[PDB]
Amino acid sequence: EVVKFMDVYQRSYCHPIETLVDIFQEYPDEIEYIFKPSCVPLMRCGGCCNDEGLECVPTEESNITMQIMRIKPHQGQHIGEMSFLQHNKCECRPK
Amino acid sequence: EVVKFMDVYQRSYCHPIETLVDIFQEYPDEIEYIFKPSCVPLMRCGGCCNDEGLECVPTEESNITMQIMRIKPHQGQHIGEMSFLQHNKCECRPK
Amino acid sequence: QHGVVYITENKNKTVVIPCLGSISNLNVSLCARYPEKRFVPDGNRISWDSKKGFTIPSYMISYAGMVFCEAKINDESYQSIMYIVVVVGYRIYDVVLSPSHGIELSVGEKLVLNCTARTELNVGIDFNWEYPLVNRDLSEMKKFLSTLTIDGVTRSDQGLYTCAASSGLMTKKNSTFVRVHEKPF
Amino acid sequence: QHGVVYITENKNKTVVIPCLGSISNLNVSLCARYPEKRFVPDGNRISWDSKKGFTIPSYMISYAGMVFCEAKINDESYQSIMYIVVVVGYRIYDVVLSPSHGIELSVGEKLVLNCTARTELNVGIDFNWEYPLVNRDLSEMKKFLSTLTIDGVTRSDQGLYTCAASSGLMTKKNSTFVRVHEKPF
């Protein structure tokens, strides 16, 4: 039950990794509503670079769409489509 | 290409999700060495709760072991086993 | 095809999912998600009535995302539609904009007014201003901020400034008077 | 079974993976990870010599995690072992502990001394103190901090205090004198 080396390497390099993101992290102004679910799974550039002076940044982005329940407390609700940004290609780059 | 509702729900609830964690985030004192790879994939409590007043916390933890290269700049290196903390069971709890 | 079930911040109330059935005595329970739990009558607090539905006090499920009743009937098991659990608040403890005290300004001088509402949790908040702008969310207590901003301030902007916050079924407001003086001398 | 290859912070140097082969003229390249790239001679900058190995200037790969040479030979393709790329630094721009100026203290008064080293990147740092404690990492410039701490400070602790930082092949130090006075009056 001990992970190999070159496994940890590839399992860890700057690449699109699924991430749980708060909706209000994406739509900070919508403070009048509340959302269920309150967060969403999105590919974001994750993992590390092989050099201090680098940073794991996206080189390809694409919004994606999911069904969220918008709720205006004491006035109603409904389930609408919300678009969210995603990373497709990641890249280590100078900082 | 639009995600269902109850899918987003379950794909997003407070549960152990694989996470890329910086080693120096775990071993902040080891400033004399440098590690390759410099980060590691670890299950950590991720996702959201169904109530403002909750928080997604672990209820079961377990260190796991991986092969990392410790490097003492200009004095040597080697590949040793490093243990890292993991979350096994997650739970929404009062804050 | 799903249902919806609201809950107040002051829990410990009692709730009824309309799991309505004919058989006066069924082994009917209430499964939940999430996390996957499954509740059963006990007379005291919990119960399911044939024509009333499944009963349970709010705080017993306020953490879940959706519940549904399910009946074990021999061959297969049959269940109701999904009801979505929704906790909501309304309590606005106070609203106060910085600064509270008066304001004497000079023409052209940038003006920034922070309006701050402290609410309980699961509160949604709408801001509304009265006067001659951007807002964001931030203990069992929330804080929303609404910041009004003007740069080129004229002499006419020298009016009373009003922020009001509505939580849905409640509303509070605070104010402050500001005067726009002409560059002195 | 793997190899290792170091690189300085001042890149634009030239490096040689010992991909040693017999055939004076092979279609040999240098594949990389990560990200998966694959380099080829061009005479000018890049080259592979039969008995010298694969050649390339540092900054061309300093981003990768491991490289290896590979030769296409008809049926199957054969490759060298894995060499691990490792960027390292040594430049310690300065070390200075807060405060720089002298210190007059009182017995029993808590003492905290921040020691701060600014280095280039990929630098590892060891701290060493001289005198009669915890440290952590924090532009193309790193900053490591080493904080010495004493609470119950006696009169004897009234010595010179020395922090020194070694990056491996370099070292700098700064100091400050502190006096421990007895509670006055």
XYZ file of C-alpha atoms in Angstrom:
560
model
C 0.000 0.000 0.000
C 2.823 2.406 -0.904
C 2.661 4.491 -4.062
C 5.330 4.166 -6.732
C 7.412 7.174 -7.756
C 6.698 7.766 -11.441
C 3.065 7.184 -10.467
C 3.010 10.069 -7.992
C 4.708 12.148 -10.663
C 2.144 11.709 -13.431
C -0.775 11.615 -11.011
C 0.369 15.043 -9.851
C 1.511 17.115 -12.815
C -0.107 20.368 -13.954
C -3.268 19.014 -15.594
C -7.056 19.537 -15.621
C -8.353 18.026 -12.379
C -12.006 17.849 -11.264
C -12.688 20.485 -8.619
C -15.597 21.360 -6.326
C -16.297 25.074 -6.804
C -18.703 27.293 -4.891
C -21.259 28.935 -7.147
C -21.044 32.238 -5.302
C -17.356 31.962 -6.117
C -18.445 32.332 -9.731
C -21.460 34.601 -9.339
C -20.642 36.823 -6.325
C -23.338 39.407 -7.078
C -26.336 37.077 -6.908
C -26.632 37.650 -3.156
C -30.423 37.867 -3.462
C -30.772 34.226 -4.467
C -29.499 30.982 -3.061
C -28.505 27.921 -5.073
C -29.033 24.187 -4.724
C -26.724 22.579 -5.050
C -24.518 25.362 -3.691
C -21.391 24.189 -5.522
C -20.348 22.381 -8.706
C -17.677 19.981 -10.051
C -15.448 21.679 -12.623
C -12.196 20.876 -14.381
C -9.640 23.403 -13.234
C -5.901 23.536 -13.773
C -4.481 21.497 -10.929
C -1.236 19.843 -9.927
C 2.255 21.285 -9.753
C 5.130 22.359 -11.985
C 8.708 21.083 -12.074
C 10.171 24.482 -11.320
C 9.686 27.115 -8.642
C 9.491 29.798 -11.320
C 6.528 28.190 -13.080
C 2.771 28.122 -12.506
C 0.064 25.728 -13.655
C -2.178 27.820 -15.890
C -4.958 27.071 -18.390
C -4.382 27.360 -22.128
C -7.891 26.285 -23.079
C -11.160 27.252 -21.390
C -14.818 26.345 -21.961
C -17.973 27.151 -20.009
C -20.179 24.140 -19.311
C -23.847 24.019 -18.386
C -25.660 22.467 -15.438
C -29.133 22.459 -13.911
C -29.209 24.556 -10.740
C -32.090 25.569 -8.505
C -32.237 29.341 -8.101
C -34.137 30.387 -4.996
C -35.381 33.831 -4.069
C -36.114 33.310 -0.336
C -39.847 33.680 0.358
C -40.668 34.638 -3.231
C -40.111 31.459 -5.258
C -37.667 29.167 -7.054
C -37.007 27.242 -10.240
C -34.389 25.063 -11.886
C -32.467 26.763 -14.655
C -29.351 26.156 -16.707
C -26.179 27.823 -15.388
C -22.974 28.037 -17.392
C -19.667 27.541 -15.623
C -16.077 27.994 -16.785
C -13.852 24.943 -17.306
C -10.207 24.297 -18.115
C -9.407 21.926 -20.961
C -5.677 22.238 -21.484
C -3.273 23.126 -18.695
C 0.307 24.363 -18.971
C 3.260 25.228 -16.728
C 4.358 28.752 -17.489
C 6.644 31.516 -16.202
C 5.209 33.575 -13.356
C -23.933 18.549 -23.167
C -25.876 19.895 -20.169
C -25.616 18.224 -16.779
C -28.693 16.808 -15.081
C -29.772 18.080 -11.667
C -29.618 15.099 -9.317
C -26.291 14.377 -11.019
C -24.776 17.717 -10.018
C -26.135 17.081 -6.541
C -24.459 13.737 -5.886
C -21.344 14.668 -7.838
C -20.996 17.597 -5.449
C -21.903 16.526 -1.925
C -19.517 16.548 1.042
C -17.390 13.495 0.221
C -13.733 12.416 -0.062
C -12.437 13.918 -3.308
C -8.925 13.494 -4.760
C -6.887 16.642 -4.175
C -3.472 17.922 -5.265
C -1.646 19.012 -2.105
C 1.696 20.777 -1.793
C 4.177 18.817 0.285
C 5.467 21.929 2.022
C 1.825 22.401 2.947
C 2.260 19.245 5.006
C 5.887 19.582 6.069
C 6.475 23.354 6.402
C 9.696 23.011 8.406
C 11.686 21.042 5.835
C 12.874 24.271 4.206
C 16.375 22.820 3.823
C 15.254 20.192 1.328
C 13.239 20.275 -1.843
C 10.889 17.554 -3.059
C 10.159 15.929 -6.401
C 7.422 15.710 -7.095
C 6.610 18.867 -5.137
C 2.980 17.901 -4.501
C 0.791 14.820 -4.047
C -2.746 13.526 -4.764
C -4.707 12.976 -1.552
C -8.309 12.284 -0.628
C -9.572 15.270 1.303
C -13.068 16.174 2.421
C -14.528 18.041 -0.519
C -17.887 19.207 -1.793
C -20.569 21.215 -0.041
C -23.271 20.876 2.601
C -27.017 21.441 2.293
C -27.050 24.133 4.940
C -25.187 27.375 5.543
C -24.600 26.363 9.153
C -22.765 23.163 8.229
C -19.224 22.310 7.141
C -17.777 19.334 5.291
C -15.426 17.708 7.786
C -13.606 14.363 8.000
C -14.753 11.641 10.380
C -12.078 9.161 9.346
C -8.416 9.867 8.591
C -5.474 7.724 7.459
C -1.922 8.610 6.452
C -0.793 7.028 3.190
C 2.715 6.469 1.885
C 4.414 7.536 -1.333
C 7.897 7.588 -2.836
C 9.295 11.124 -2.862
C 12.720 12.430 -3.802
C 14.227 14.457 -0.967
C 16.929 16.826 -2.166
C 19.432 18.752 -0.095
C 20.643 21.310 -2.690
C 24.336 20.766 -3.482
C 24.731 17.996 -0.905
C 22.740 15.059 -2.293
C 19.361 13.369 -2.720
C 17.483 10.100 -2.434
C 14.012 8.644 -2.817
C 12.298 7.830 0.446
C 8.831 6.941 1.663
C 6.740 9.880 2.915
C 3.482 9.442 4.794
C 0.610 11.793 4.061
C -2.758 12.286 5.751
C -5.951 11.210 3.969
C -9.679 11.501 4.579
C -11.774 8.352 4.343
C -15.196 9.350 5.597
C -16.568 12.865 5.266
C -19.488 14.441 7.113
C -21.476 17.688 7.166
C -21.422 19.076 10.670
C -22.328 22.193 12.666
C -19.756 24.979 12.526
C -41.102 15.415 -11.461
C -40.087 16.489 -7.962
C -41.434 18.337 -4.933
C -40.104 21.025 -2.600
C -39.953 21.475 1.176
C -38.890 24.654 2.964
C -37.461 25.066 6.496
C -36.964 28.122 8.710
C -33.754 28.978 10.559
C -35.584 28.475 13.850
C -35.769 24.707 13.353
C -37.381 22.292 15.807
C -40.625 22.766 13.885
C -42.593 19.861 12.407
C -42.867 18.915 8.725
C -45.066 16.718 6.543
C -44.104 15.120 3.254
C -47.393 14.296 1.453
C -46.629 10.600 1.191
C -50.326 9.846 0.936
C -51.411 6.214 0.813
C -54.529 4.085 1.125
C -53.489 1.197 3.374
C -54.180 2.286 6.953
C -51.105 0.404 8.140
C -48.032 0.255 5.925
C -44.369 -0.445 6.595
C -43.576 2.950 5.055
C -40.334 4.799 5.770
C -38.621 8.015 4.671
C -35.282 7.587 2.903
C -32.968 10.635 2.576
C -30.076 12.085 0.523
C -27.756 13.352 1.599
C -26.365 11.743 3.358
C -28.253 8.545 2.608
C -30.308 8.003 5.740
C -33.691 6.292 6.274
C -36.211 7.209 8.987
C -38.951 5.214 10.738
C -42.013 6.113 12.880
C -41.760 5.766 16.664
C -45.090 7.199 17.755
C -43.549 9.881 19.967
C -41.956 12.232 17.441
C -42.034 10.371 14.115
C -45.033 8.949 12.271
C -46.626 8.216 8.918
C -50.381 8.492 8.481
C -52.235 6.804 5.633
C -53.930 9.964 4.370
C -51.783 12.570 6.138
C -48.290 11.694 4.909
C -44.901 11.218 6.552
C -44.227 13.360 9.606
C -41.012 14.540 11.236
C -39.664 17.686 12.959
C -37.505 19.927 10.752
C -34.161 19.743 12.571
C -34.229 15.986 11.973
C -33.491 16.407 8.260
C -32.541 20.055 7.701
C -29.115 18.779 6.656
C -30.370 16.624 3.777
C -30.690 17.632 0.133
C -33.782 15.638 -0.783
C -36.179 13.163 0.853
C -38.786 10.690 -0.378
C -41.003 8.076 1.222
C -40.587 4.396 0.365
C -42.764 1.368 1.035
C -41.610 -2.233 1.176
C -44.236 -4.388 -0.508
C -43.143 -7.995 -0.991
C -41.987 -8.322 -4.614
C -40.563 -4.882 -5.364
C -40.343 -1.631 -3.406
C -42.213 1.509 -4.433
C -41.459 5.124 -3.528
C -42.750 8.690 -3.853
C -41.219 11.434 -5.963
C -38.238 13.418 -4.780
C -38.901 16.333 -2.440
C -36.109 18.880 -2.237
C -35.187 20.145 1.218
C -34.547 23.897 1.433
C -33.427 25.813 4.513
C -34.152 29.541 4.412
C -33.797 32.489 6.772
C -35.102 36.023 7.146
C -33.652 37.478 10.330
C -31.847 40.745 9.617
C -30.153 41.686 12.862
C -29.027 45.118 11.691
C -27.985 47.334 8.801
C -25.355 50.047 9.158
C -23.301 51.937 6.592
C -19.765 53.188 7.179
C -19.549 55.836 8.222
C -22.575 56.251 10.486
C -21.705 59.825 11.439
C -22.241 62.666 8.982
C -19.941 63.345 6.042
C -18.526 66.604 4.737
C -16.885 66.163 1.342
C -15.234 68.221 -1.399
C -16.231 68.404 -5.068
C -14.436 65.828 -7.207
C -13.396 63.790 -4.169
C -14.131 60.060 -4.576
C -16.997 58.804 -2.425
C -17.328 55.247 -1.183
C -20.076 54.095 1.155
C -19.997 50.608 2.653
C -23.470 49.301 3.561
C -23.422 46.261 5.821
C -26.196 43.863 6.754
C -25.816 41.165 9.385
C -28.276 38.322 8.910
C -28.759 34.820 10.191
C -27.701 32.051 7.852
C -29.412 30.781 4.714
C -30.582 34.348 4.246
C -30.834 35.876 0.782
C -30.497 39.657 0.637
C -31.596 42.425 -1.704
C -30.103 45.913 -1.359
C -31.932 49.119 -2.280
C -30.677 52.683 -2.171
C -32.367 56.052 -1.801
C -30.454 59.224 -2.596
C -30.108 62.094 -5.106
C -22.373 50.430 -6.839
C -21.487 46.768 -6.113
C -22.286 44.165 -3.413
C -21.004 40.773 -2.206
C -21.454 38.177 0.567
C -18.656 37.775 3.141
C -20.764 32.433 14.449
C -24.277 31.594 13.229
C -24.412 34.919 11.398
C -23.936 36.072 7.787
C -22.743 39.459 6.525
C -23.581 40.996 3.150
C -21.961 44.222 2.006
C -23.237 46.744 -0.512
C -20.789 49.429 -1.566
C -21.945 52.526 -3.387
C -19.277 54.444 -5.288
C -19.031 57.831 -6.987
C -15.870 59.663 -8.027
C -16.710 62.954 -9.691
C -18.941 64.180 -6.898
C -20.933 67.315 -7.707
C -22.617 69.740 -5.314
C -25.995 68.145 -6.079
C -25.040 64.754 -4.638
C -25.317 66.487 -1.259
C -28.437 64.503 -0.364
C -29.413 61.985 2.297
C -28.188 58.481 1.572
C -30.283 55.424 2.294
C -29.438 51.750 2.246
C -32.166 49.209 2.873
C -31.884 45.439 3.061
C -34.752 43.011 2.516
C -34.383 39.338 3.457
C -37.626 38.416 1.810
C -40.121 38.644 4.644
C -38.219 41.350 6.531
C -36.393 44.613 5.927
C -34.144 47.045 7.771
C -32.409 50.269 6.787
C -29.853 52.792 8.029
C -28.815 56.196 6.677
C -26.283 59.016 6.754
C -26.297 62.609 5.576
C -23.492 63.811 3.338
C -22.696 67.354 2.212
C -20.717 68.160 -0.934
C -18.787 71.389 -0.337
C -17.114 73.317 -3.125
C -13.314 73.363 -3.050
C -12.651 75.865 -0.196
C -10.789 79.218 -0.260
C 16.954 2.218 -12.217
C 17.060 5.922 -13.048
C 19.513 8.791 -13.444
C 19.660 12.399 -12.262
C 20.400 15.745 -13.918
C 20.856 19.043 -12.090
C 20.361 22.610 -13.399
C 21.377 26.005 -12.011
C 19.074 29.014 -11.703
C 21.215 30.841 -14.254
C 19.996 28.627 -17.097
C 21.120 28.960 -20.714
C 23.896 26.495 -19.903
C 24.426 23.266 -21.850
C 23.647 19.726 -20.673
C 24.497 16.170 -21.703
C 22.433 13.073 -21.036
C 24.830 10.091 -21.360
C 22.808 8.427 -24.091
C 25.899 6.601 -25.277
C 25.627 4.446 -28.385
C 27.823 2.644 -30.892
C 26.307 3.500 -34.275
C 28.001 6.691 -35.464
C 24.755 7.844 -37.058
C 21.454 7.021 -35.387
C 17.974 8.501 -35.621
C 18.116 9.088 -31.857
C 15.906 11.641 -30.114
C 15.225 12.822 -26.561
C 11.669 12.325 -25.309
C 10.524 14.264 -22.198
C 7.970 14.251 -19.342
C 6.478 16.514 -18.447
C 4.984 17.683 -20.452
C 5.478 14.941 -23.018
C 7.783 16.543 -25.558
C 10.408 15.025 -27.895
C 13.559 16.802 -29.104
C 15.730 16.368 -32.211
C 19.264 17.484 -33.229
C 19.638 20.500 -35.521
C 23.400 20.913 -35.582
C 23.328 24.492 -34.298
C 22.186 24.064 -30.699
C 20.981 20.458 -30.425
C 22.898 17.263 -31.159
C 23.469 13.637 -30.240
C 26.931 12.119 -30.496
C 27.511 8.373 -30.682
C 29.912 8.223 -27.739
C 29.172 11.612 -26.160
C 25.423 11.401 -25.537
C 22.459 13.686 -26.170
C 23.160 17.406 -25.951
C 20.921 20.387 -25.257
C 21.092 23.716 -23.366
C 19.453 23.691 -19.921
C 16.664 26.240 -20.420
C 15.322 23.987 -23.177
C 14.076 21.403 -20.672
C 14.348 22.962 -17.206
C 10.560 22.692 -17.024
C 10.422 18.912 -17.459
C 10.364 16.292 -14.716
C 12.347 13.557 -16.439
C 14.014 12.926 -19.810
C 15.327 9.879 -21.661
C 16.775 9.214 -25.092
C 14.965 6.952 -27.552
C 16.055 5.350 -30.808
C 13.786 4.193 -33.606
C 15.138 0.917 -34.954
C 12.802 -0.774 -37.428
C 10.932 -3.488 -35.504
C 10.660 -2.018 -32.013
C 11.949 1.163 -30.379
C 14.549 1.137 -27.614
C 15.270 3.809 -25.008
C 17.619 4.753 -22.165
C 16.749 4.826 -18.483
C 14.916 7.734 -16.934
C 16.974 10.769 -15.951
C 15.321 13.073 -13.445
C 15.570 16.798 -14.114
C 16.310 18.932 -11.042
C 16.528 22.721 -10.938
C 18.455 24.116 -7.976
C 19.593 27.531 -6.782
C 22.078 29.026 -4.349
C 21.854 32.800 -4.614
C 21.179 34.350 -1.211
C 20.566 38.019 -1.881
C 20.485 39.038 1.775
C 19.734 38.062 5.356
C 18.315 40.513 7.883
C 16.583 39.996 11.216
C 13.874 42.270 12.597
C 14.784 44.423 14.234
C 18.143 45.426 12.762
C 18.752 48.159 15.332
C 19.750 47.284 18.886
C 17.304 45.985 21.480
C 16.872 46.915 25.124
C 14.561 44.500 26.925
C 13.224 43.781 30.412
C 13.500 40.525 32.366
C 10.556 38.201 31.769
C 9.482 40.096 28.651
C 8.799 37.783 25.683
C 11.417 37.975 22.939
C 10.738 37.228 19.294
C 13.317 37.662 16.554
C 12.334 37.297 12.905
C 15.253 36.241 10.679
C 14.598 36.696 6.975
C 16.504 35.395 3.977
C 15.733 36.425 0.415
C 16.929 33.876 -2.121
C 16.416 33.134 -5.771
C 14.045 30.304 -6.559
C 14.580 26.564 -6.218
C 16.791 27.433 -3.274
C 16.883 25.224 -0.190
C 17.843 26.973 3.043
C 19.355 25.965 6.367
C 19.246 28.375 9.315
C 21.852 28.480 12.085
C 21.942 30.651 15.178
C 24.723 31.934 17.405
C 23.901 33.411 20.796
C 24.087 32.809 24.572
C 12.639 28.644 17.467
C 10.706 27.844 14.250
C 11.065 28.571 10.502
C 8.953 28.425 7.320
C 9.007 29.333 3.604
C 6.790 32.211 2.413
C 9.062 38.252 -8.505
C 11.769 35.661 -9.201
C 12.684 35.659 -5.514
C 11.950 33.406 -2.517
C 11.775 34.353 1.165
C 12.425 32.020 4.095
C 11.824 33.136 7.663
C 13.381 31.809 10.849
C 11.850 33.032 14.085
C 13.627 32.582 17.384
C 11.467 32.834 20.496
C 12.078 33.099 24.235
C 9.601 34.183 26.902
C 11.184 34.059 30.336
C 14.192 36.144 29.390
C 16.944 36.251 32.010
C 19.783 38.752 32.368
C 22.195 36.228 30.833
C 20.429 36.162 27.461
C 21.927 39.631 26.987
C 24.286 38.372 24.281
C 24.829 39.044 20.591
C 22.361 37.249 18.357
C 23.376 35.705 15.065
C 21.329 34.253 12.251
C 23.085 32.652 9.311
C 21.568 31.156 6.182
C 23.267 28.601 3.945
C 21.847 27.795 0.504
C 24.197 24.908 0.024
C 27.112 26.474 -1.809
C 26.654 29.921 -0.259
C 25.980 31.567 3.085
C 25.100 34.972 4.500
C 24.422 36.258 8.002
C 23.177 39.317 9.878
C 23.132 40.147 13.593
C 21.786 42.385 16.341
C 22.806 43.082 19.914
C 20.212 42.774 22.651
C 20.480 43.768 26.310
C 18.334 42.250 29.059
C 17.782 44.897 31.742
C 16.371 44.085 35.154
C 12.907 45.473 35.880
C 13.704 49.191 36.499
C 13.130 51.332 39.629
